[PDB]
Design an enzyme around this catalytic site. Structure first.
Site, PDB file in Angstrom:
ATOM      1  N   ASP A  13      -6.228   8.357  -0.819  1.00 57.25           N
ATOM      2  CA  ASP A  13      -5.835   7.317   0.122  1.00 57.25           C
ATOM      3  C   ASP A  13      -4.687   7.862   0.955  1.00 57.25           C
ATOM      4  O   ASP A  13      -3.721   8.384   0.400  1.00 57.25           O
ATOM      5  CB  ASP A  13      -5.341   6.078  -0.630  1.00 57.25           C
ATOM      6  CG  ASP A  13      -6.424   5.410  -1.467  1.00 57.25           C
ATOM      7  OD1 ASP A  13      -6.069   4.715  -2.450  1.00 57.25           O
ATOM      8  OD2 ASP A  13      -7.626   5.548  -1.157  1.00 57.25           O
ATOM      9  N   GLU A  44       0.806  -1.222   0.000  1.00 61.79           N
ATOM     10  CA  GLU A  44       0.000   0.000   0.000  1.00 61.79           C
ATOM     11  C   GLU A  44       0.839   1.272   0.000  1.00 61.79           C
ATOM     12  O   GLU A  44       0.553   2.193  -0.757  1.00 61.79           O
ATOM     13  CB  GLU A  44      -0.964   0.039   1.191  1.00 61.79           C
ATOM     14  CG  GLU A  44      -2.151  -0.918   1.097  1.00 61.79           C
ATOM     15  CD  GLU A  44      -3.208  -0.522   0.070  1.00 61.79           C
ATOM     16  OE1 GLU A  44      -2.981   0.378  -0.762  1.00 61.79           O
ATOM     17  OE2 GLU A  44      -4.274  -1.157   0.090  1.00 61.79           O
TER      18      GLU A  44
END
Ligand code: NA
Length: 129
Positions: free
Chosen positions: A53, A35
């Site tokens: 994000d 991520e």
């Protein structure tokens, strides 16, 4: 903050993530690697929902934190998205616990693509835990 792997492993374990709702520490380390590359200040724009994000868990602003600029958005973790990028990952971990409890580990597409059905044992290699 950019974490070293074992430093992160120790931190996530101290914060109660090892085995949390069935997700092993090594799975969390694989997820956060893919991520965010262990960077608490990681951000990525998602044009599909005109959202961002944030942080080590790449938590999305449409659903989970408030950043003001995201249209058609809510704040599921009751937190400013900025707080999910603090050097101290406590609030980020709390929000991850909420997300995984609500939506499961498959909430993280990066985990599905890079970690699920992979042996992730190497993520704790050489770490004192
Ligand atoms: Na939001």
């Amino acid at each position: 903050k950019v974490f070293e792997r074992c430093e992160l492993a120790r931190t996530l374990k101290k914060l109660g993530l090892d085995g949390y709702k069935g997700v092993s520490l090594a799975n969390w380390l694989c997820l956060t690697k893919w991520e965010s590359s262990y960077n608490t200040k990681a951000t990525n724009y998602n044009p599909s929902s005109e959202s961002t994000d944030y942080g080590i868990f790449q938590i999305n602003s449409k659903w989970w934190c408030n950043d003001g600029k995201t249209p058609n958005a809510v704040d599921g973790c009751h937190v400013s998205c900025s707080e999910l990028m603090e050097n101290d990952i406590a609030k980020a971990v709390a929000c991850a616990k909420h997300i995984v409890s609500e939506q499961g580990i498959t909430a993280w597409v990066a985990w599905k693509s890079h970690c699920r059905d992979h042996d992730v044992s190497s993520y704790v290699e050489g770490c004192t835990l």
